[PDB]
């Protein structure tokens, strides 16, 4: 079973540096080209760098060129991406992939790299309250606003995972302040609001923040 496992991702200031790793299994990185590909949030795939099977040497995208450096360890088959002088534009999910020769037939699970001046901060959770004016037929809407957190990701559940139907947790938006914000909503029968409690469970692992907010009229 071929398998690539990544690590080393995280949060850094502009001008800082990080080192990504790529643990290979079921094969050795000697007989294959290894590539790094990144994907910024909501954007397309971008090739970063590659290294040859036999000898080393390198090929880099113009956007990187002389800021990152790809390498590998033959003994412990592991590819590396030494990122230096990072900028905000380098914020993306980074993948490592094996090229066979036809194409990148195996990919790592990917790892998030955030480059920003913002400090780590947990979300403030505010209720989006149901109301008698906020119905569509017998259906009522309610939710939770998860505001001003950094970095990604946050996870949201409702009633500890018991409530999934009708739930919409929207993609985060990057505000001008450098912090993220999103809402999670759910539609339920208005007749249930009297005898049903609704709690959004917000988890922000990067800040060790766990919040449970009850939503009521």
């Amino acid at each position: 079973e071929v398998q690539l496992v990544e690590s080393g991702g995280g949060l850094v200031q502009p001008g800082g540096s990080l080192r990504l790793s790529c643990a290979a299994s079921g094969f050795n990185v000697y007989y294959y080209y290894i590539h790094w590909v990144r994907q910024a949030p909501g954007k397309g795939l971008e090739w970063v760098a590659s290294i040859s099977p036999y000898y080393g040497y390198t090929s880099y995208a113009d956007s990187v060129k002389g800021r990152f450096t790809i390498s590998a360890d033959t003994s412990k088959n592991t590819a590396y991406l030494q990122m230096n002088s990072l900028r905000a534009e380098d914020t993306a999910v980074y993948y490592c992939a094996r090229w066979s020769y036809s194409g990148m037939d195996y990919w790592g699970q990917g790892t998030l790299v955030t480059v920003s001046s913002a400090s780590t901060k947990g979300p403030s959770v505010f209720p989006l309250a149901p109301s008698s004016k906020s119905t569509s037929g017998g259906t009522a809407a309610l939710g939770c606003l998860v505001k001003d957190y950094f970095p990604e990701p946050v996870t949201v559940s409702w009633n500890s995972g018991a409530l999934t139907s009708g739930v919409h947790t929207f993609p985060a938006v990057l505000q001008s302040s450098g912090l993220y914000s999103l809402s999670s909503v759910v539609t339920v029968p208005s007749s249930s609001l009297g005898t049903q409690t609704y709690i959004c469970n917000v988890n922000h692992k990067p800040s060790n923040t766990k919040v449970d907010k009850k939503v009521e009229p």
Partner: protein
């Protein structure tokens, strides 16, 4: 490099995605498929077929299965370097569905925190394209809101959308009437939801 383009299609449809050859000098092309939150997959091409339209490269799906709805990327290699083309998101076509609209005033807890966010929710609609216009004391707003859209729902293939108006606490207290106005394919007239502060 940029947001993927969109293509609406039904199950059983035939789709052909063209990839323009830049200035390469070989037929080195590879196609990938990516679903939300997951790594891309190299396309192994039965219903998938690759060809050469003029000098350009094409990928054809003879009969779309539910599992085929995803973002597709064309990759050209040199092979001293690699380039990904813009993504092409293949979306499930369904009947037009008008959104139901809800507005949410800022909580007292948020005002206590020094900010006021007003949220407009658009639920269960199709197509994805919808316009939300904010009004404060009957003044049309611009530059102080942001939108966000879910992926296509697995069950009914509809979308939901949130629009958030962000104002300072002090400014929020200076106005009374807050409203979001929704425009959409399925709406013959704009739908407005509003509230009076207090």
């Amino acid at each position: 490099t940029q947001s993927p383009s969109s293509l609406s299609a039904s199950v059983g449809d035939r789709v052909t995605i063209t990839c323009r050859a830049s200035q390469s000098v070989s037929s080195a092309v590879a196609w990938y498929q990516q679903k939300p939150g997951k790594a891309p997959k190299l396309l192994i091409y039965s219903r998938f077929s690759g060809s050469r339209s003029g000098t350009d490269f094409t990928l054809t799906i003879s009969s779309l299965q539910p599992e085929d709805f995803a973002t597709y990327y064309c990759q050209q290699y040199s092979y001293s370097l690699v380039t990904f083309g813009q993504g092409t998101k293949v979306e499930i076509k369904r009947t037009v569905a008008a959104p139901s609209v809800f507005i949410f005033p800022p909580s007292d807890s948020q005002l206590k925190s020094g900010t006021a966010s007003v949220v407009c929710l658009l639920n269960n609609f199709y197509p994805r394209e919808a316009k939300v216009q904010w009004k404060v004391d009957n003044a049309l707003q611009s530059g102080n809101s942001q939108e966000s859209v879910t992926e296509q729902d697995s069950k009914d293939s509809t979308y939901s959308l949130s629009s958030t108006l962000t104002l300072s606490k002090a400014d929020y207290e200076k106005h009374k009437v807050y409203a979001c106005e929704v425009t959409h394919q399925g709406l013959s007239s704009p739908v407005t939801k509003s509230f009076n502060r207090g």
